[PDB]
Amino acid sequence: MGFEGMFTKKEGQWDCSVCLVRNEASATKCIACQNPGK
Amino acid sequence: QVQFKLVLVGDGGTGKTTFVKRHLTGESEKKYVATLGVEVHPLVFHTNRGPIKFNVWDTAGQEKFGGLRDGYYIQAQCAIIMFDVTSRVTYKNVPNWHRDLVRVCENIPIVLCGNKVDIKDRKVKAKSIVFHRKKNLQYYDISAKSNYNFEKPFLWLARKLIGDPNLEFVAMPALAPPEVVMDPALAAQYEHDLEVAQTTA
Ligand SMILES: Nc1nc2c(ncn2[C@@H]2O[C@H](COP(=O)(O)OP(=O)(O)O)[C@@H](O)[C@H]2O)c(=O)[nH]1
Numbered sequence: 001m002g003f004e005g006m007f008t009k010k011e012g013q014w015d016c017s018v019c020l021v022r023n024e025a026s027a028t029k030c031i032a033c034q035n036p037g038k
Numbered sequence: 039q040v041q042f043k044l045v046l047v048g049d050g051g052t053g054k055t056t057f058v059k060r061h062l063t064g065e066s067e068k069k070y071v072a073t074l075g076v077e078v079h080p081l082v083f084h085t086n087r088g089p090i091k092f093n094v095w096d097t098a099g100q101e102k103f104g105g106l107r108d109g110y111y112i113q114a115q116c117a118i119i120m121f122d123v124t125s126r127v128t129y130k131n132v133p134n135w136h137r138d139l140v141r142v143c144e145n146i147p148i149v150l151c152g153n154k155v156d157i158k159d160r161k162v163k164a165k166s167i168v169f170h171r172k173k174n175l176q177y178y179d180i181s182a183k184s185n186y187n188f189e190k191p192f193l194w195l196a197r198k199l200i201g202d203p204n205l206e207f208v209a210m211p212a213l214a215p216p217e218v219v220m221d222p223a224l225a226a227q228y229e230h231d232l233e234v235a236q237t238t239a
Pocket residue numbers: 048049050051052053054055056057153154155156157180181182183184218
């Protein structure tokens with residue numbers, strides 16, 4: 001078997017291109033490094 | 039692609055950078071974070087249930103316990119604490135590093151790593167390791183410069199994070215060739231010493 005989408009990304013979530021932290025839709029800048037979400 | 043942020047903490051000179059650099063692809067595809075002074079190494083491990091990626095956060099400076107910024111710890115899902123088995127003071131500060139992790143990240147799986155076991159003049163021996171009750175704190179001997187037990191912290195963390203005890207790495211990642219030999223006789227004795235001590239606690 002696979003991981004069965006255990007760690008699926010929620011629709012609004014975005015992965016920061018700079019530091020790879022997963023951010024919530026409401027975040028416009030990354031919560032760890034403050035890089036803007038595109 | 040499941041991925042986890044892993045923070046790699048411990049006193050300076052313990053071998054954190056040497057350790058994470060062993061994973062060759064994670065070094066070639068590492069990311070620098072200018073605002074935080076941090077390098078994120080994306081380490082891929084291939085399990086029997088698929089690829090897992092540990093995004094390992096390595097400091098660029100020799101900051102003490104409580105010296106790292108808040109953004110370093112943000113969204114950390116696991117951790118490795120490192121000390122040098124030839125320096126007791128680095129092991130004395132393991133509890134300090136552990137407090138900082140609980141304070142800012144609450145309950146995450148943590149592995150404890152005594153590095154540089156290739157050195158014969160080992161000060162911190164298995165009999166001297168203070169083992170603890172919590173199941174979020176496992177100890178492993180490692181030698182970064184020899185790749186000795188390199189995959190064990192990650193395999194344990196993978197098992198706790200995924201919630202599967204029988205999770206296997208079907209293959210070892212491409213690691214940098216050893217720069218020192220891990221004497222197999224020392225290794226055989228250390229493995230046995232560790233086994234007897236973990237049976238006690
Ligand atoms: N014999 C031995 N030396 C190591 C090992 N790991 C690191 N060293 C050395 O310990 C020194 C500090 O290494 P470094 O990665 O910068 O530690 P850091 O400050 O935690 O990043 C360096 O001289 C390393 O070459 C090891 O596993 N075995």
